[PDB]
Write a protein that binds this ligand. Structure first.
Ligand code: HEM
Length: 296
């Protein structure tokens, strides 16, 4: 025995088109607007984006294991990954939604939520594609493919390689750290990254470059970069600044929100599609209208 990389073919939910997804979208979107009290009124947007990434983040380019495709997060093994501590809130918010549209696969719904959360938070438009098919439980990836936080630029670069992401991709995607914040209880990390943490903007790069960062120890006994302004950064975050390579992307993005959003949009979609072979007859990526765009 030899390891051919699996091949995952996207098969659109039987009989669904643009209009159906848009509906899933608006639901998620409306429920975001409605459950505003979550996490100190930060809302469910950031967790939802955290959920889409972590479901895609199990991917291993070599043997085509993990990734969005299978919706394996719905299983225990994955669901209980110490790395996904806190994600249950997102699962919990997506549920009722899955009730209303039972016909959507899990990878599809989970991926779709992140996209929504992104657009709903005024970030860019992320072209999405349907077609992920739930896979059995044995197809769940063992715990541990998710990055550790107490590392450096070397680790982060080596890590992203497994997901086929390059430096510009890594920095673009990291910017999502402007959303939500760290909860000690989840991660051993505590605190926000900046002020506008439920509106997607380039705040993370700016902060990274303009604040006065100091390595301290949290109540969890780990080290984090604290700014006097009350923000924080992970070591992996602070590293985007020690690497010289990384550092000029950060500057470019802190300099142009615009580029930043294009770069992210293209990479986030990639993250969400890693591992899936879409047939050529497959349709194009949809691009959901936001509620606003819809007058809803
Ligand atoms: C080196 C890579 C990464 C590491 C080590 C890292 C780790 C972290 C940690 C530990 C937290 C706090 C979790 C908690 O305590 O609730 C966090 C939060 C989160 N992560 Fe990352 N992150 C990684 C990559 C990224 C990626 C690429 C994305 C999205 C594109 C991102 C999006 C988020 C967001 C939006 C949250 C906020 C979660 C919330 O507010 O509950 N992260 N991540």
């Amino acid at each position: 025995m030899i390891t051919t990389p699996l091949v995952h073919v996207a098969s659109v939910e039987k009989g669904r088109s643009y209009e159906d997804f848009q509906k899933v979208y608006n639901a998620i979107a409306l429920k975001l607007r409605e459950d505003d009290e979550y996490d100190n009124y930060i809302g469910y947007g950031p967790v939802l984006v955290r959920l889409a990434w972590h479901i895609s983040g199990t991917w291993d380019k070599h043997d085509n294991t993990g990734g969005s495709y299978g919706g394996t997060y719905r299983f225990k093994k994955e669901f209980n990954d110490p790395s996904n501590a806190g994600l249950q809130n997102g699962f919990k918010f997506l549920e009722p939604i899955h009730k209303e549209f039972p016909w959507i696969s899990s990878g599809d719904l989970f991926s779709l939520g992140g996209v929504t959360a992104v657009q709903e938070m005024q970030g860019p438009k992320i072209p999405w594609r349907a077609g992920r098919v739930d896979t059995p439980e044995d197809t769940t990836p063992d715990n541990g493919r998710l990055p550790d936080a107490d590392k450096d630029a070397g680790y982060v670069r080596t890590f992203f390689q497994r997901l086929n992401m390059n430096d510009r991709e890594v920095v673009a995607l990291m910017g999502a750290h402007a959303l939500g914040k760290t909860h000690l209880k989840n991660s051993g990390y505590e605190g926000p990254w900046g002020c506008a943490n439920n509106v997607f903007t380039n705040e993370f790069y700016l902060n990274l470059l303009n604040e006065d960062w100091k390595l301290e120890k949290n109540d969890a006994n780990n080290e984090q970069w604290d700014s006097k302004s009350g923000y924080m950064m992970l070591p992996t975050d602070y590293s985007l600044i020690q690497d010289p390579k990384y550092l000029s992307i950060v500057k470019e993005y802190a300099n142009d929100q615009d580029k930043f959003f294009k770069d992210f949009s293209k990479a986030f979609e990639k993250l969400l599609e890693n591992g899936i072979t879409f047939p050529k007859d497959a349709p194009s990526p949809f691009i959901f209208k936001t509620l606003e765009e819809q007058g809803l």
